[PDB]
Ligand binder design. Structure first.
Ligand code: NA
Lengths: 112, 152
């Protein structure tokens, strides 16, 4: 379920930049779809939550997706740059996936 | 009676995250799925045996997929081969995860639809208790349309 991690950076304790590679054998693509493998929107949210809960906001849980936009399709062979910002005072996790232009972006609320 | 829920989707196992079509009409769809270790959600459970709350968007998206699939089949139209989620708005969950054993009712109401684009408001409930509300936008492109999108 997790993609291949090429590199991670953390320029502040509340920010992360992760370079990810989508392999053809990634199980998200299985049956999604026969005519074209496409990365589901939920998988992009899933990884945001993994890096958020492990690097940025440990002990915080999912509450809502206030807004998400998927504006470009992603397929195997793509390299992604994932940028995440955690604003603890706002309870607000913001993210953007860029093709290594912007593939997706959103705002998630967490609760403790 | 309805076909198996996978028959209304371009999706195939293991990426079909619903188990039962309960009802479909011109402006509504009701589908069902159970949070179990033996069912379609088992690959997506967290270390504690629960389905994370954010999978609500995918269950809601697929319910919209079932809606469009059913209507294409009633209209003797070609099966869709692709489905895309374009966006979600205020997808708010009362719990961080759906507990093992929960029977989930996914109920979507049509706002706006055309050939390819769809806009739906949604609710996930468990025995009448509302656990998630939200709005979703979807897109059902041709394979050629998708190639043009990818390349142009
Ligand atoms: Na199918």
């Amino acid at each position: 379920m997790k993609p291949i991690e090429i590199h991670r950076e953390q320029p502040a304790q509340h920010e992360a930049m992760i370079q990810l590679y989508l392999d053809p054998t990634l199980d998200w693509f299985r049956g999604h779809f026969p005519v074209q493998p496409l990365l589901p929107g939920v998988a992009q949210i899933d990884w945001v939550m993994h890096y958020a809960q492990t690097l940025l906001a440990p002990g915080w849980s999912f509450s809502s997706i206030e807004m998400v936009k998927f504006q470009f399709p992603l397929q195997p062979g793509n390299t992604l740059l994932l940028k995440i910002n955690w604003d603890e005072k706002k309870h607000l996790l913001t993210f953007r996936y860029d093709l290594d232009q912007t593939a997706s972006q959103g705002k998630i609320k967490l609760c403790r | 009676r309805y076909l198996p829920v996978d028959r209304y989707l371009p999706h195939e196992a293991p990426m079909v995250l619903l188990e039962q079509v309960i009802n479909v009409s011109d402006n509504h769809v009701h589908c069902q799925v159970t949070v179990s270790r033996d069912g379609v959600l088992s690959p997506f459970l967290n270390q504690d045996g629960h389905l994370p709350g954010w999978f609500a968007i995918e269950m809601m998206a697929q319910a919209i997929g079932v809606w469009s699939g059913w209507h294409r089949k009633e209209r003797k139209e070609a099966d869709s081969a692709l489905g895309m989620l374009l966006g979600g708005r205020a997808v708010r969950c009362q719990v961080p995860a759906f507990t093992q054993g929960s029977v989930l009712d996914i109920q979507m109401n049509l706002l706006l639809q055309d050939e390819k684009f769809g806009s739906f408001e949604g609710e996930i409930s468990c025995y009448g208790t509302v656990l998630v509300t939200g709005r979703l936008n979807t897109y059902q492109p041709n394979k050629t349309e998708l190639i043009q999108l990818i390349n142009k």
